[PDB]
Amino acid sequence: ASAQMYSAFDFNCPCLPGYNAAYSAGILLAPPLVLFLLGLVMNNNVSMLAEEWKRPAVLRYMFCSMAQRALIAPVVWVAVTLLDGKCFLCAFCTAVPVSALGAPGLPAPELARLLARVPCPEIYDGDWLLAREVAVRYLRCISQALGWSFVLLTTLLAFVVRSVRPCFTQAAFLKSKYWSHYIDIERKLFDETCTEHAKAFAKVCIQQFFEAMN
Amino acid sequence: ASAQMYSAFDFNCPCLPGYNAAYSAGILLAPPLVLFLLGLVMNNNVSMLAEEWKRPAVLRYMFCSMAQRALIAPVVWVAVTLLDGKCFLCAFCTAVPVSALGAPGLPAPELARLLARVPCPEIYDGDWLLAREVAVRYLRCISQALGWSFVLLTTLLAFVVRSVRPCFTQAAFLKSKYWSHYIDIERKLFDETCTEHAKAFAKVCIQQFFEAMN
Amino acid sequence: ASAQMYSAFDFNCPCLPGYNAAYSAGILLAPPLVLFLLGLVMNNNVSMLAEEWKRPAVLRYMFCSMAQRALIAPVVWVAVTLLDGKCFLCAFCTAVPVSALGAPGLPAPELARLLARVPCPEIYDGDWLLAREVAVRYLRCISQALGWSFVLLTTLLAFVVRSVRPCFTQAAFLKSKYWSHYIDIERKLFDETCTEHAKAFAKVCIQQFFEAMN
Amino acid sequence: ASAQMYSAFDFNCPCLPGYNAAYSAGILLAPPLVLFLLGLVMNNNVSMLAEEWKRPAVLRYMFCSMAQRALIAPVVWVAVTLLDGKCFLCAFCTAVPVSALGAPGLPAPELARLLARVPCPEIYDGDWLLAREVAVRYLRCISQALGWSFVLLTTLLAFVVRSVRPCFTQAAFLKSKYWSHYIDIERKLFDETCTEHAKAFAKVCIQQFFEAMN
Amino acid sequence: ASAQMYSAFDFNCPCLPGYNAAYSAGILLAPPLVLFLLGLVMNNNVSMLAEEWKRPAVLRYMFCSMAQRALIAPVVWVAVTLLDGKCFLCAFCTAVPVSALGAPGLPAPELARLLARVPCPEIYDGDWLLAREVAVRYLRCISQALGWSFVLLTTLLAFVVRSVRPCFTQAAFLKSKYWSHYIDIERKLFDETCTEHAKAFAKVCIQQFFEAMN
Amino acid sequence: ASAQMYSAFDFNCPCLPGYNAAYSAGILLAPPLVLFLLGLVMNNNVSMLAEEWKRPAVLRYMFCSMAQRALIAPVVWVAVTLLDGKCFLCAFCTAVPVSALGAPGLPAPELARLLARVPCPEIYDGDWLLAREVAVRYLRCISQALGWSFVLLTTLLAFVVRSVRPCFTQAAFLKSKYWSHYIDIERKLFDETCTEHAKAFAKVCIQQFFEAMN
Amino acid sequence: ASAQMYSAFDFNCPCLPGYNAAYSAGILLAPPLVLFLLGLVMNNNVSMLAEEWKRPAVLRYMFCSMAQRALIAPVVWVAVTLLDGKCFLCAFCTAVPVSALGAPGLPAPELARLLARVPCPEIYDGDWLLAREVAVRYLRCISQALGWSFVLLTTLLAFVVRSVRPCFTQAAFLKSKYWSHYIDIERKLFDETCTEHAKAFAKVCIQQFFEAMN
Amino acid sequence: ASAQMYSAFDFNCPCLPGYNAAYSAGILLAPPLVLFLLGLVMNNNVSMLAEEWKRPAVLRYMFCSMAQRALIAPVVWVAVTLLDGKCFLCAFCTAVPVSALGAPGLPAPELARLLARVPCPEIYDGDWLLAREVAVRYLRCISQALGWSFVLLTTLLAFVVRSVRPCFTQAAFLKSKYWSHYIDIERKLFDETCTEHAKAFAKVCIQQFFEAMN
Ligand SMILES: CCCCCCCC/C=C\CCCCCCCC(=O)O[C@@H](COC(=O)CCCCCCCCCCCCCCC)COP(=O)([O-])OCC[N+](C)(C)C
Ligand SMILES: CCCCCCCC/C=C\CCCCCCCC(=O)O[C@@H](COC(=O)CCCCCCCCCCCCCCC)COP(=O)([O-])OCC[N+](C)(C)C
Ligand SMILES: CCCCCCCC/C=C\CCCCCCCC(=O)O[C@@H](COC(=O)CCCCCCCCCCCCCCC)COP(=O)([O-])OCC[N+](C)(C)C
Ligand SMILES: CCCCCCCC/C=C\CCCCCCCC(=O)O[C@@H](COC(=O)CCCCCCCCCCCCCCC)COP(=O)([O-])OCC[N+](C)(C)C
Ligand SMILES: CCCCCCCC/C=C\CCCCCCCC(=O)O[C@@H](COC(=O)CCCCCCCCCCCCCCC)COP(=O)([O-])OCC[N+](C)(C)C
Ligand SMILES: CCCCCCCC/C=C\CCCCCCCC(=O)O[C@@H](COC(=O)CCCCCCCCCCCCCCC)COP(=O)([O-])OCC[N+](C)(C)C
């Protein structure tokens, strides 16, 4: 439910020397933060939970669970961005070593107005000190290697929580389990009494509804 | 049920210096207002609700509920417009800084008749003071950043109503729950009596229908 | 069941100065009128309804209902025509301000024989006083804005009938409800007697059908 | 089951001055007549119906019904032909006003051998007195307007038969209803007796079929 | 099950002056004759039927039925050939009036070696006395008109057999009906006795199959 | 299950004067012979059938049946080859009458090295005595006519076996019918005894499997 | 499950005079050997079978069965390779008769460095002694003929094992049949006892699980 | 669940002489290691297993099983990389024998800056000592041969574990089987008691929920 957005969600990368960090860093942080606290609003175990959490048990449970199953969305929508390589080229294009690993120099301020124009766009000035195909696929390299290094740092970190017992014990987990299926039971518990008691005054008001004219 | 309309619904953007604000602001406000008060007409809990709401309980409920589930359509059809970037370029094209972040100047009134012609269309005059690919993807940038900032302002705002108790208490919600499944019950309550009582005069009039000729 | 016709139903727009109003206004009025009184012929509650409606109750009901559910087809097939913009350009092409918002003039009658040739077709004469891409997408603008203004005038108008009680009361609606499922009941009421009574003379004539030769 | 034939069924339009009326009028009349009396052969209530209809009741029913449900095929396969515009251009191409609404004249007989060559084909002679794109889309206009005027003349006419009582009364309709489900009942009536009586001589001849060798 | 073959079944039309009649008339007669007596071999009511039909009742039935339901395949695979127009152009290309309705003449035998080369192929000699696009779409015209005239001659002829009583009476049809479901009954009649009697010697030979080693 | 192979199974046609007969006749005989004796290996009524068929009843049955239902594969994969026309052009390309029905002559041996190069390939030498499009579509003609003549010779021949009684009588067919469903019955006959008798020693060995440690 | 791999599995054919035999013979032997002993690992009747097959009955059965049903994969993935013709051209390209059936000669070692470059690749040197289209489609011929000759040698060989009794008798086949459905029976035999006995200590440990706090 | 990632997961191959080994070896090791210890986190038999595995039976089981079924993902995502040939060309491009099997030499350091630019990219310098199509499809050869040699080394190695008894005996496997379906049984064991005991205080608190106002 994350990578599908990346198919049609376009990317812009404004080639202006100094706004790049914004639009670059803007797209890598916002969707995670919005995806995180959006799926959290979907789990129905949230509403009353913060209600009684301010008056002064299960105080350390029923919040770690939501924190886990709702924290899979951001970590995937932040890894797929790195592996593509369009979010990284847009940002650090202004800091590629020119005279080496690219020869002649140029003035300082105008150069930033030149090298900043070497993402994907077809408005790049061209020849001097750099060929566009050589600049890219070098920054795309550093992203993907830095990318895979990220997911190792997470998937390994997902091996301790599901293998160690942070808040997984019979202190409140078992007790909180007692809250599991009472509420939905209360849905079909009072509903039968509610639906039945509605039948009490049903026939009473229904008097004129039987027949008369027909 | 919102983004699907944006697939085939064309966009025009009339390159005339002064009507742009209309056609731009026209398309960003109308569909929300029409989508809002259209889904509201779909919920069957609306008809009698305004009926008795003028004679002088549940006065503060049964209207907030409809206001919520029917207010998801506009907020999505107003975010997708920003992220695309065709509604914003059409409007503020007349206020892009020319001499900087774009050099030679020109007369005032004719310039508005020139810069106003730089959306998507292929009738742009061209060279002076601006390249068309540089104008766009700078306004497309400001939209998307302003766009994501919008949805954060909403999805976070969708975290207080579903986590705080605005009109969520046992004052009328429980009482209004008693109105929940009586009406549909009344559908199949009098129907059995109605369908049965119809069988009363059925055999009476059916006398000549048994047989005679055959 | 309306917009699907607009996919393959071609459009012609004859570039002749004076027939345009016909073929333009012809296509915007006829399909509504034919769609309206066609779906009306589909509701089975129509046949006897006009029968007894001329001899001199439910006189103000059982006709407003059909008038509603069968009046959704035209209002949609008349909004989709405006939003496209091909029905409006074909008509008012002869009244676009030339010397402004388009320079040199020309004779009166021949001009109508020129400006009338600027819809979609690729037979337009060309240069003088107007560029074809500038004429269109200005009339396409006025249509869409006028279009959305239409649907607001209707969807809002669809909020009073479903929220006010024009003919929605227990004067004949409840009485007319008594006619609801008697007729279809009469279908399977006399059918069992008819199908049964057919079995009366069945065995009588079936005498020679048992066996003899075999 | 009508418009589908129009997808792959090719059209020819022989550009010969005098056969056009044949091939034009030929394709607009034949498929209706063949579609009409073809679906009539499908309704199983036809066979004996004409049998006893010549020896000298239901004499005015059981033929109007078939005449209705089998007369929907032609009226649709004759409207779709008009709206397309390829059946009309092929016919009246020889009678388009040349000197006006099209300038120099020509000899009479050769002209018919020229104007007759202006349907779709790419063998048109060209320049004089008419541009091919102007001839078509003027005759295509007159067809579609004449087309929609047709379907109004029919769909309105389909509003009197389903709203007036031509042969819809309890004179023979109810009596003819008695013939409704006897015949199919006679199918499974004698079949059980036939299938059963077959079991009579079944075991009789089956004597040598039990066992002996095995 | 007929027109589907016409999709991939290629057509050749050998442009040789004198073999055309063969390959043309060859493809219009053979598939009907093969389709006719092929579906006839599918109806299981054929095998014994010709068996006892030579020793010297139902003598005039049980053969007309097969003759009808198996004669729908050829009549459709012979109409679709005409309407296409590739079977007719291939044959009568040698008899198109040249000097009229097409000017200069030529020698007799070589002309047949020229006009015979004007089907679809792109090896036509060209200019003299005929343009290839004018020859075709004139013979394609005569086919389609002659084609529709055919299907009228058949579908009308299909209105007398299903409306008159050629061999539809209670002379052998009812008697032959007695043969309808006895045979398939005999399938599951002796099968139960056969399957049962097989169980007789089943346990007898199964003696060593119970157990011993295990 | 035959024509599907002809879709992707490529064809080569080596243009060498003297190997053509091999690769041509090679592909028309092998797949039939392999398809024939392959489907024969699929019918489970084959294994023991040849077993007891050599020791010295049903001797003339139970082999004609397999010979029929397994001989439908080759006759279809040998007709589809003719109708295509690529198997025939590849073979008899060396025997097309050149000086007539095609003018100047040439030496004998080199000519065979030329005319042999006129299948589909684009390495044909060209001009003299023959145009490539005229050679093909003449041999493709003779194949298809010879092809349809084949299938008539078979489908008609399929009308005598299914209408005459070659080995269709109550001499061994009825007796062999007694072998029909005993074997599969023997599958579920001893299986119940086998599966049951397995339960004998099941509980005996299962002693240590109940419980002890747990 | 074999030919599907051949769709996307690319082929390389390194045009180097002397490695061709390796990469050619490498791809024709390995996949068979890996497919053979891979499907063998899938049949669950293999594990214990080799276990007791070394300590010193069914010694000649239960291994021939696996050898058959798991030997269908290689024989198909080795026939499809021949019929394509890309595995054979890659190998024997260095041994095509040049001076005949292809004229001028050349030095020995360099020639091998030339003729070795005439597979599919577009780096072939060209003119002398051979045209690339003539070399291929001659080796492609010898493969396909040699290919079909292969499958005849196998499918015929598949007619003796399924028609003769190599290891098909009541010596161990019937005895080994007794091992057929005991093991899976043992799955659901001890499972019911295991699942039941688990219920023994279930209620014992479940004491504190009933209720107390709630 | 492995090869699907290889469809859209792009590949970069940065043509810089010395980073190639990193990006090459980086992509061949990381996904295996991440796929391995990711599927391991999916098997629910892992959590408590490491818990009690540190306090100082089944000590040598319940870890070999997970090690097997979760070690199929890496071995497939490491074989598909070799067979493609894009991971190997990217690495060893700097060590292809130039003067042989490719003539003139060049300086040492610049040469590495040239030969390193001969993967897929279209920035290769060109002519001297090597043609790009000859370099590739020679390294692609060595990969595929080395590739198939790999999978033989594994699939054969997968024949001993499933045919020998490493940890497959009745020492702890049978005992560990006793842990198989108790836990899920404990899910629906205490749940019925938990769901039931919830019904204890259900009616107690439900007192005010029956009726009063209605
Ligand atoms: C068509 C569909 C497309 C498919 C996509 C294909 C491509 C796929 C590519 C890659 C797939 C990678 C999968 C990753 C592993 C997922 C599991 C996981 O992580 O769960 C853990 C998450 O919670 C944590 O414990 C981690 C928290 C670490 C902090 C990270 C900061 C994030 C904020 C951003 C700031 C960054 C700033 C720094 C910027 C550098 C634990 O929760 P869980 O509930 O126990 O997990 C259950 C695991 N299970 C589900 C298997 C059992
Ligand atoms: C193929 C399909 C395409 C998919 C699209 C993919 C792209 C998706 C992109 C983005 C997705 C973004 C999702 C947003 C969050 C939705 C939820 C929500 O907001 O609900 C809230 C809405 O009601 C409110 O409380 C907000 C009201 C704020 C006022 C906004 C003005 C709007 C008028 C316009 C004037 C603007 C003028 C100013 C112009 C700047 C609360 O109601 P709820 O019932 O409690 O919500 C339940 C939430 N749940 C559903 C999860 C539980
Ligand atoms: C993918 C699919 C494609 C879809 C197509 C999309 C395009 C659609 C475009 C258009 C759709 C138009 C629909 C038309 C209305 C149909 C109903 C109707 O007409 O029934 C009537 C027909 O019988 C009559 O009463 C009319 C007879 C008039 C005579 C006409 C001459 C015809 C002969 C030719 C000579 C011409 C010579 C003159 C030449 C100028 C009455 O019968 P009914 O049984 O009561 O009808 C029930 C109606 N109901 C079904 C709703 C209840
Ligand atoms: C994707 C699918 C493609 C669809 C195709 C779309 C295109 C469709 C185009 C057209 C459709 C046309 C349909 C035709 C009508 C069919 C019905 C019929 O004819 O039955 C009759 C046939 O038997 C006869 O009575 C006729 C015999 C006349 C002799 C003809 C010679 C044929 C031999 C050749 C020598 C020629 C030599 C002369 C050369 C000039 C009677 O039998 P029935 O059992 O009572 O019929 C039941 C009718 N029902 C089925 C409705 C109830
Ligand atoms: C997408 C799918 C593609 C569809 C394809 C579309 C194209 C279709 C085109 C054409 C379809 C043609 C169908 C043909 C008829 C089939 C029936 C038949 O023949 O059965 C008979 C076959 O057995 C025989 O009796 C014939 C034996 C004659 C010997 C032929 C030599 C063959 C060896 C080669 C050497 C050649 C050397 C000489 C070279 C010149 C009898 O057996 P049956 O069991 O009683 O048959 C039941 C019939 N039924 C099934 C209807 C009841
Ligand atoms: C659309 C879908 C695409 C399809 C793809 C098509 C292409 C397919 C192409 C090829 C398919 C190849 C299949 C391989 C066989 C799989 C089975 C197997 O191996 O299981 C074994 C794995 O565990 C082991 O025993 C092997 C461990 C060896 C160490 C390898 C190092 C790996 C680390 C990397 C470092 C490398 C460093 C060195 C670099 C050179 C045993 O476990 P099992 O549970 O008993 O297996 C059951 C087998 N069964 C499943 C049949 C019963």
Numbering used by the authors:
A (entry chain H), B (entry chain B), C (entry chain A), D (entry chain C), E (entry chain D), F (entry chain E), ...: 30 to 85, 94 to 139, 144 to 255
What's written in the study?
Calcium homeostasis modulator 1 (CALHM1) is a voltage-dependent channel involved in neuromodulation and gustatory signaling. CALHM1 is the recently identified member of a large-pore channel that permeates ions, including Ca2+, Na+, K+, and Cl−, and small molecules, such as ATP, in a voltage-dependent manner. Furthermore, the ATP efflux through the CALHM1 channel in type II gustatory cells and the subsequent purinergic signaling has been shown to facilitate the perception of sweet, bitter, and umami taste sensations. Our studies here showed that the human and chicken CALHM1s have a conserved structural fold, oligomeric assembly pattern, and a phospholipid-filled hydrophobic pocket for controlling channel functions.
To compare structures and assembly patterns of mammalian and non-mammalian CALHM1 channels, we determined the cryo-EM structure of human CALHM1, as well as that of chicken CALHM1 prepared using an identical protocol. Our single-particle cryoEM resulted in the octameric chCALHM1Δct and hCALHM1Δct structures, resolved at the overall resolutions of 3.36 and 3.76 Å, respectively. The structures revealed that the chCALHM1Δct and hCALHM1Δct protomers have a similar protein fold and octameric assembly pattern, where the C-terminal helix (CTH) and TMD4-CTH linker are the major determinants for controlling the oligomeric state. As is the case for non-mammalian CALHM1s, the most extensive inter-subunit interactions form between the TMD2 and TMD4 and between the CTHs in hCALHM1. Our hCALHM1Δct structure allows mapping of key residues for functions and human mutations, Pro86Leu and Arg154His, implicated as risks of Alzheimer’s disease. In our hCALHM1Δct structure, the cryo-EM density was resolved up to Pro85 but not Pro86. Arg154 is surrounded by residues, Arg158 and Gly139, from the neighboring subunit in the hCALHM1Δct. Additionally, Asp121, which has been reported to modulate calcium sensitivity and ion permeability, is located on TMD3 and at the inter-subunit interface with TMD4 from the neighboring subunit to contribute to the structural integrity of the oligomer. Inspection of the hCALHM1Δct and chCALHM1Δct structures reveals a hydrophobic pocket ~15 Å in length (parallel to the TMDs) and 10 Å wide, located between TMD3 and TMD4 of one subunit and TMD2 of the neighboring subunit. In both hCALHM1Δct and chCALHM1Δct, we observe phospholipid-like density nestled into this pocket, which appears to fortify the local architecture by interacting with the hydrophobic residues in the pocket.
